[PDB]
């Protein structure tokens, strides 16, 4: 178990790499196909049935999502019949293209693509795992992106950040809070692409660190919005201003960092005199901040720490490169004059 | 009369100054002129290497004369 | 031609109401590999009279990871049915 | 924008460089700074003025890397300046030479109030 | 100690007031100009800068 | 499809009210059916006559509201004036939303019908007048 | 600024850094010294204008307006102490960072040199003071409160983004106020409508109107340990002046639609000062004040034309300094009397007869005894809006006789007799109590000496 | 996004299995096989948003 | 009394230094280079 335990975790990586350094239709097909099947023994571990009756739904959703980009892609075999990555040739096959690899991307339809999986999984050690899966798709809609019919991926954009500004009211479970918004940066993120493909992995890097941040303070006890309460009082109080160093720069405020995609967003937006799309856009952004505020109101503010059992120990968690996390997560928006140089 | 040369100056430093600082502006605001001049209307032409997408290398072509005449 | 229309409707037998839906679970993942074979055969049309004669490896390596991507779901089914007996697609517990 | 797979090519040799003790070096790992004492801050460290090498080396991190971060930086819109201007220089029609005249000619609107 | 916690804080200011000058050593643009403000023969506008 | 509004902006202008809403009732009637279709499959398994769905009647709301949708344009577009203007397209917004007020009863829901379906209706005539695009290219 | 944040920064690793109970006459003690270094390098001469050093600072030249921001944090530390003393002191020291937070980002904006570094220092606030309603502040319904804090200012300030960019890829940059001297015209459209709807709009979230100004009594009715941050909040609702900077220039020619910002902030300036006769708070019953003869400036701006700029400057500073000592009025008389409800206070005028007369001066700022800072500004207003018309006198007039009676309604409300209770409220106000009662009115009349100083361009 | 590790050094993944006539193992050609030398020809340093035009 | 582990601590002061010797030797370098080119 413990030696193979890395070496499963290895094998993933590696299949993103060949998605990214490949040539060839066929390459980046078994790509994240191997992917799609180095996943599913982390999902198990504990063998509970919960885990089989969440990673079988999570299996045949992208099993599809595999299986329909080959119909994509024998149609420009037989349309001109060259295989480097490139544009389609075909308005019915760009439509094939995208709207099979938003699956895996999950948009604002195919809903509890997300929520049912990242909900009922025991490991809430990591399920850090799916931002490999927002990873490696990116990786190729930067080369599919001078052939799309424009309108189709403007309005899974439109409607993604729709319904994950709408998810999370009815919500206490923390995973489905964290499993919402994953859908909201994967709007902007798309939104920007017709419009200078360059710059959106600085949306990419921005959202991979403040999840990176989020889950590993929540590695401390809470799975519970409730067992949220239950922690500056009993684990650490220093805890409790960290986590709100957070979820109000994922909002997106101009003195912390969390802001400066969106800054920079509209500069690159406008120019192209597109307004009433980014106007729309940023005022649904408002009702991003109204999970974590209503959320920050329960660990800051001391909301009854009942169920006496004082924890007079020590703590030894693996709090692996913690610390120099938020770092770039608050302080870096001065930091920022050209973080469109070094990336593109 | 002892107030000023103990403490500041008068039209030798805050004049001149505005006439230093407002030649850092045309510099500024006239290249900020010429990005929308250039990157959004390129167009067509694609002749600055901004637009440049990769097609095809002809490197790795053939020309043997391979066993059928009529190809 | 008409033998690409016919076969064009064979790969709509993928149809989602009837790829995940009813229960008997295993009429579900039977077409899914059953979606395999619309697909190798529609390219070795292409690649055969057009001879390419190096595009031949990618058929075969597609049944490679057809059957592969097939033996995983299948173990899970099993899995299902270890502690219930019964596929029944009905069974649902952990809600959205 | 060719010889792809570079970190920073051969042809950025003509750079000043962006040298030391700029106030952004001074602020990469300034922050550094701030950031170790929040590692002792986690595991109860009690102290805050902890052990110098857990002190240190968060300094030595950010400093190398952000000078070795500027250097593309400073290359890239310089590299974006080197296409433009030739741009600029050939397609006059594309670049109007436009006749500067003084305020004798233009008669604005006029509103007053 | 000697009570660096004291005084030693607002002894910051002429030590950003050092810093103070470093902008405009820099901002040597025009000399000619027309206002008198004219650098015209003297060392009174060539001064403090 | 792209085709109805092409033939939308073009011809009426406010006149010939007999193919005016002939033709704007059509987006009325084509947008009730997609909600339809969610309303038997994601609302659970209905009546033995499919679609047999939970309230129903949505076509029925929708092809009337497309219906005065045009209707209160040509109408008033002819009367005042003959332009189309944004206070003249702005009576299409009110009574046109209390369909949605008549219908599931007032008081709440009917109250805000007038309110938010009158300013976005004026909007668009405005936006094709300055010259806006939503979907725009370099 | 040369040097002015540089030195402030350097006071805040001096909280934790110290200590024990040293840490508070130790951060007076620093913060004082300051307030010379503004006073000295600033207050010059002074014809258009005097761009500071660089890219950075304009060196506030044609208002001041900096002296005031000073002022305050050398004053609610004093204030303060009457009520936080009951906790740990690494959870005191983060409750005296925050506030001097506060300052740094205002003392680099009201000068700001810029547009797009205004707007993320005009939004760089609202994060410290939200912390201070969530903790440490009074009874429930605090939440709520906090989030009708948010979701107006941030609802409306994000069109400036969409505005401000607009300009500067149209014509030119706007990173010089200074460069803007080739402004073209702005003709009516259903364009450009909105391009100036966007471009004020944000700035009447903050400086209220008739509409959407609920929020403003609940941080101030729902509000910090006695006065802490509502001190505060006042220069927060002031410090709006950025219309001076923007709509100077900037499509002026647009006055065709002015007349439902002039009409609604008139009409609705006569009833708001009446809404409040009825009130039964004491937080709240300034609150209300603190609208009206707010809402007198508005009016000034967007009808141009000076003669309204003059008045328009120095009523920013006029309840500024007011209502600042009426809210150290109110956070005292709480400390004694644990509910801020003003019907309770009967029977006052015997005990403390030392601060009696501190009730009469203050509110002898409303009335306003012409020889002062407050009815010197007025009579400039009237100065320009009769000019526009002769009606304009008659609404106006009456918010100076309803005021009247509404700053006399809490006077007589401190005598009555015989007081039916409190063998509590002994106290016969301490040093605390009235030497920052203090230094309000000291600089105000002062001020009133010669009053050159408090004058615009203009 | 595509980093090509396969340019700088010199080794192919494959790039051969890639259009109609690259290697044909002993030199029997394709149908097509003429207008593929042909089609390369016209847009090699073409930066294809003008290749369609 | 003072129990460190007394391997890794020097190792990172050490190697610090090594990065600072590095950083100077890159940059004194390439200072030189600037001028040695352009
Ligand atoms: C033991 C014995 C010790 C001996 C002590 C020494 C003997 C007494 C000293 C002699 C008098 C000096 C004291 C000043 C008062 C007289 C001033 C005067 O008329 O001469 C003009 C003379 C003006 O000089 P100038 O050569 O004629 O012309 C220069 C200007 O161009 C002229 O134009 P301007 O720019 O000055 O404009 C006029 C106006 C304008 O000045 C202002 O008002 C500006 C100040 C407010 C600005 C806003 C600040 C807001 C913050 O100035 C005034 O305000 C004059 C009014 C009286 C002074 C104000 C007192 C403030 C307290 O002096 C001044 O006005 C300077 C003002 C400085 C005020 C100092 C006040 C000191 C008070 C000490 C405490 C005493 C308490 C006693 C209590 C006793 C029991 C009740
Ligand atoms: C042997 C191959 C190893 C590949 C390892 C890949 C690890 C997975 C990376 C996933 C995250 C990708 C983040 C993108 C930014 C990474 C930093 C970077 O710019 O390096 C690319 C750099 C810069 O790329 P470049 O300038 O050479 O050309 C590629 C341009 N982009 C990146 C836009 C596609 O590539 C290198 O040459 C490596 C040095
Ligand atoms: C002297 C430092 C304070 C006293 C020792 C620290 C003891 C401690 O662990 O307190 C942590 C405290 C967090 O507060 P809290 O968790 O709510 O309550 C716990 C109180 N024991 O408060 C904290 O110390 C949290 C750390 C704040 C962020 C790091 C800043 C480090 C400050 C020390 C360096 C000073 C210079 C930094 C500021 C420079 C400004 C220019
Ligand atoms: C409702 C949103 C109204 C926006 C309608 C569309 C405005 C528009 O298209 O832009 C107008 C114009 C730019 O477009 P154009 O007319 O073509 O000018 C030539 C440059 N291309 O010029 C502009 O860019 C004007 C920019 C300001 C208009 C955008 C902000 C208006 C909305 C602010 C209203 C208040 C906020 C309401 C929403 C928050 C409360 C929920």
């Known amino acids: 178990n413990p030696i193979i335990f890395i070496i499963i975790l290895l094998t993933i990586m590696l299949g993103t790499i060949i998605v990214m350094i490949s040539s060839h239709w066929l390459l980046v097909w078994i790509g994240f196909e191997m992917n799609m099947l180095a996943i599913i023994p982390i999902m198990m571990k504990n063998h509970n049935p919960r885990a089989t009756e969440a990673s079988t739904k999570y299996f045949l959703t992208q099993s599809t999502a595999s299986m329909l980009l080959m119909m994509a892609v024998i149609i420009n075999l037989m349309f001109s019949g060259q295989w480097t990555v490139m544009k389609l040739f075909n308005p019915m096959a760009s439509m094939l293209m995208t709207m099979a690899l938003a699956m895996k991307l999950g948009m604002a339809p195919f809903h509890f693509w997300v929520p049912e999986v990242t909900q009922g999984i025991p490991l809430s050690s990591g399920l850090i795992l799916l931002t490999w899966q927002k990873l490696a798709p990116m990786s190729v809609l930067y080369q599919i992106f001078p052939s799309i019919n424009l309108n189709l991926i403007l309005t899974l954009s439109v409607l993604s950040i729709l319904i994950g500004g709408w998810g999370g009211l009815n919500q206490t479970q923390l995973r489905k809070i964290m499993a919402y918004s994953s859908i909201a940066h994967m709007g902007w993120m798309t939104a920007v692409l017709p419009y200078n493909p360059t710059m959106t992995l600085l949306n990419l890097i921005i959202y991979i660190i403040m999840t990176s941040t989020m889950f590993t303070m929540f590695m401390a006890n809470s799975t519970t919005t409730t067992l949220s309460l239950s922690h500056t009082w009993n684990k650490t109080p220093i805890m409790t201003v960290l986590i709100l160093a957070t979820l109000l720069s994922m909002g997106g405020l101009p003195p912390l960092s969390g802001f400066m995609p969106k800054w920079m967003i509209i500069q690159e937006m406008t120019k192209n005199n597109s307004i009433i799309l980014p106007t729309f856009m940023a005022i649904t952004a408002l009702l991003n901040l ?35 996390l938020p770092t770039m997560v608050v302080l870096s928006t001065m930091m920022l004059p050209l973080t469109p140089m070094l990336s593109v | 009369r002892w107030i000023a040369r103990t403490f500041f100056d008068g039209p030798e430093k805050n004049y001149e100054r505005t006439m230093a600082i407002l030649q850092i502006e045309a510099e500024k605001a006239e290249l900020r002129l010429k990005e929308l001049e250039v990157r959004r209307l390129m167009r067509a032409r694609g002749d600055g290497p901004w637009f440049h997408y990769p097609t095809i290398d002809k490197e790795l072509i053939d020309h043997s004369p391979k066993a059928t005449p009529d190809n | 031609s008409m033998v690409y229309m016919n076969i064009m409707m064979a790969f709509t037998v993928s149809l989602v109401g009837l790829l995940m839906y009813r229960s008997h679970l295993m009429s579900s993942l039977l077409c899914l590999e059953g979606m395999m074979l619309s697909l190798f055969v529609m390219a070795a049309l292409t690649i055969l009279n057009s001879h390419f004669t190096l595009a031949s490896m990618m058929p075969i390596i597609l049944l490679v990871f057809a059957a592969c991507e097939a033996a995983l779901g299948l173990s899970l089914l099993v899995m299902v049915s270890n502690t219930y007996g019964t596929d029944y697609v009905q069974n649902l517990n952990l809600l959205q | ?80 300046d080197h296409d433009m201007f030739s741009y600029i220089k050939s397609h006059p029609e594309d670049f109007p030479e436009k006749d500067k005249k003084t305020y004798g000619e233009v008669f604005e609107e006029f509103h007053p109030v | 100690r000697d009570h660096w916690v004291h005084v030693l804080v607002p002894m910051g200011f002429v030590f950003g007031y050092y810093l103070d000058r470093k902008n405009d050593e820099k901002l040597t643009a025009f000399r000619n100009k027309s206002l008198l403000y004219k650098r015209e023969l003297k060392p009174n506008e060539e001064v403090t800068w | ?46 009546s033995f006559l499919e679609g047999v769905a939970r309230t129903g009647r949505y076509t029925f709301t929708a092809a009337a509201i497309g219906a005065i949708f045009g209707l209160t344009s040509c109408i008033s577009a002819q009367v005042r004036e003959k332009p189309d203007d944004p206070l003249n397209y702005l009576i299409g917004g009110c009574a046109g939303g209390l369909i949605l007020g008549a219908r599931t009863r007032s008081y709440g829901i009917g109250a805000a019908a007038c309110a938010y379906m009158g300013l976005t209706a004026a909007l668009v005539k405005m936006g094709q007048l300055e010259g806006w695009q939503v979907f725009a290219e370099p | ?138 009874q429930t319904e605090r939440l709520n409160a906090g989030l009708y804090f948010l979701f107006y200012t941030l609802a409306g300030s994000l069109p400036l983004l969409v505005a401000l960019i607009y ?31 966007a471009c004020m709009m944000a700035f009447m979230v903050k400086m209220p109107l008739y509409g959407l100004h609920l929020w403003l009594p609940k941080a101030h009715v729902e509000a910090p340990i006695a006065g802490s941050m509502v001190l505060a909040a006042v220069l927060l609702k002031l410090g709006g002046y950025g219309m001076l ?62 003669w309204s700029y003059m008045g328009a400057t120095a009523l920013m500073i006029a309840h500024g300094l007011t209502s600042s000592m009426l809210f150290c009025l109110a956070n005292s008389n709480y400390e004694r009397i644990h509910s801020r409800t003003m019907i309770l206070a009967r029977g006052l005028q015997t005990l403390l007869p030392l601060m009696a007369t501190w009730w009469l001066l203050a509110s002898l700022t409303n009335l306003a005894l012409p020889p002062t800072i407050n009815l010197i500004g007025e009579l400039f207003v009237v100065m320009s809006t009769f000019s526009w018309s002769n009606i304009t006198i008659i609404l106006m007039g009456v918010n100076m006789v309803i005021t009247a009676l509404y700053s006399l309604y809490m006077l007589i409300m401190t005598q009555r007799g015989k007081y039916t209770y409190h063998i509590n409220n002994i106290s016969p106000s301490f040093t605390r109590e009235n030497a920052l009662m203090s230094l309000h009115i000291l600089p105000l009349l002062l001020l009133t000496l010669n009053p050159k100083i408090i004058l615009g361009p203009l | 996004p595509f980093f090509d590790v396969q340019k700088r050094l010199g080794v192919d993944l494959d790039r051969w299995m890639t259009i109609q006539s690259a290697e044909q193992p002993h030199k029997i050609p394709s149908r097509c096989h003429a207008f593929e030398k042909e089609w390369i020809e016209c847009a090699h340093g073409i930066g294809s948003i003008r290749a369609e035009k | 009394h003072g129990s460190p582990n007394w391997l890794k601590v020097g190792l990172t002061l050490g190697t610090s230094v090594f990065l600072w010797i590095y950083l100077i030797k890159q940059h004194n370098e390439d200072v030189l280079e600037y001028k040695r080119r352009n």
């Open chain 7, 245 to 306: 900077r923007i709509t100077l220039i900037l499509n002026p020619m647009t006055d065709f639609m002015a007349y439902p910002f002039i009409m609604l902030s008139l009409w609705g300036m006569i009833m708001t000062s009446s809404i409040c006769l009825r009130q039964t708070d004491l937080k709240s019953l300034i609150a209300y004040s603190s609208v009206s003869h707010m809402a007198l400036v508005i009016v000034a701006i967007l009808i141009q034309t000076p």
């Open chain 6, 1 to 46: 499809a792209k085709t109805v509004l092409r033939q939308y902006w073009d011809i009426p202008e406010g006149t010939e009210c007999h193919r005016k809403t002939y033709a704007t009732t059509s987006i009325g009637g084509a947008a009730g059916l997609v909600v339809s279709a969610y309303s038997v499959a994601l609302k659970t398994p209905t």
């Open chain 7, 1 to 138: 600024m040369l040097k002015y944040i540089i030195p402030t920064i350097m006071l805040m690793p001096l909280t934790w850094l110290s200590k024990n109970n040293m840490i508070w006459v130790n951060s007076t003690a620093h913060s004082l010294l300051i307030s010379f270094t503004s006073l000295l390098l600033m207050n010059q001469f002074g014809d258009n204008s005097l761009n500071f050093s660089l890219l950075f600072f304009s060196d506030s030249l044609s208002t001041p307006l900096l002296i005031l921001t000073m002022w305050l944090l050398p004053l609610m530390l004093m204030a303060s102490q009457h009520h936080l003393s009951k906790e740990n002191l690494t959870r005191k020291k983060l409750f005296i960072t925050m506030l001097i937070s506060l300052q740094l980002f205002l003392i680099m904006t009201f000068t700001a040199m810029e547009l797009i570094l205004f707007y993320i220092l005009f939004e760089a606030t609202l994060v410290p003071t939200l912390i201070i309603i969530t903790r440490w502040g009074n």
């Open chain 1, 290 to 324: 109204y999970f974590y505020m209503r959320l920050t109101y329960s660990t800051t503010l001391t909301m009854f720490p009942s169920t006496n059992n004082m924890k007079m120990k020590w703590q030894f968690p693996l709090m692996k490169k913690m610390t120099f």
């Open chain 7, 167 to 197: 300009i500067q890829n149209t014509v030119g940059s706007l990173n010089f106020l200074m460069l803007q001297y080739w402004v073209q015209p702005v003709h009516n459209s259903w364009s450009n409508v909105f391009m100036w709807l």
């Open chain 4, 1 to 80: 924008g060719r010889a792809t797979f570079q970190f920073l090519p051969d042809e950025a040799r003509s750079l000043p460089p962006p040298k030391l003790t700029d106030p952004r070096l001074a602020f990469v790992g300034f922050l550094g700074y701030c950031s170790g004492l929040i590692d002792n801050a986690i595991r109860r460290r009690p102290v805050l003025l902890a052990g110098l090498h857990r002190q240190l080396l968060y300094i030595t991190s950010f400093v190398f890397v952000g000078y070795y971060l500027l250097k593309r930086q400073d290359y890239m819109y310089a590299v974006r």
